[PDB]
């Protein structure tokens, strides 16, 4: 009926982590290659490459992520990076616009540019649908931060080797999220399952994106537009 102290340390260090690695001013967006309206590809690669760096910064501040082997950390990041970027982008996704909004009109990304960044509606139809789903949950930032850490800490990812230890961590995070909803979220009494439902949605979007990324990365005139981080993280090594 009440969160323990360690349960609320986990919450506190996770909210601090997110506040350090997400910037609501989006002022750093002016250092990317500008968007042109595959004319959107260079600005998207830059956007995603920057975001991957945030996710790594966030991951390093999750209690005990750092204590995994460097290999397990890489395996988790390589499989879960795109899911975490889809997750955190909810903070810039607007329901009135049905777009993401990270600046003036130039950092407003709409979906009609989908084919301009080398993707199809087969990815952006479910993604947008996911994004309004997640927005309707109207999450406290505690819950939003908790889902990213749980998403990152999935033992069922390709490459993981110590899927006991990281399942324990993921368990400790769900006990917090389960309890947070019970104690702190009014009308939070089926929100956990809905949230876990969103995790499985991600694995489906992940897949679609990984299939479409393969088509890009295999045409060198397109893969030359990506950054080295993107190529290493979404690569297959």
């Amino acid at each position: 009926h009440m969160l323990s102290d360690e349960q609320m340390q986990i919450i506190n260090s996770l909210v601090e982590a997110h506040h350090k690695t997400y910037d609501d001013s989006y002022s750093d967006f002016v250092r990317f290659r500008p968007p042109v309206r595959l004319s959107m590809l260079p600005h998207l690669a830059d956007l995603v490459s920057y975001s991957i760096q945030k996710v790594i910064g966030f991951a390093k501040m999750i209690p005990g992520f750092r204590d995994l082997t460097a290999e397990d950390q890489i395996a988790l990041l390589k499989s879960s990076a795109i899911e975490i970027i889809m997750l955190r982008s909810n903070q810039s996704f607007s329901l009135e616009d049905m777009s993401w909004s990270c600046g003036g009109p130039d950092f407003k990304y709409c979906i009609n540019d989908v084919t301009k960044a080398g993707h199809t509606l087969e990815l952006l139809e479910p993604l947008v649908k996911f994004q309004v789903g997640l927005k309707k949950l109207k999450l406290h930032e505690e819950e939003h931060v908790l889902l990213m850490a749980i998403c990152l800490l999935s033992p069922d990812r390709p490459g993981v080797q110590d899927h006991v230890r990281i399942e324990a961590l993921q368990d400790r995070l769900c006990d917090v999220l389960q309890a947070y909803i019970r104690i702190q979220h009014p009308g939070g009494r089926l929100l956990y399952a809905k949230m876990i439902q969103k995790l499985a949605d991600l694995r489906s979007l992940n897949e679609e994106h990984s299939k479409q990324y393969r088509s890009l990365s295999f045409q060198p005139e397109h893969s030359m537009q990506l950054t080295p981080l993107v190529l290493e993280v979404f690569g297959s090594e």
Binding site: I56, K60, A70, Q73, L77, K78, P228, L229, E232, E237
Partner: peptide, 10 residues
């Protein structure tokens, strides 16, 4: 093999 990632993970 993941030169950048290792670097970023300190």
């Amino acid at each position: 093999r993941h030169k950048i990632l290792h670097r970023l993970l300190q």
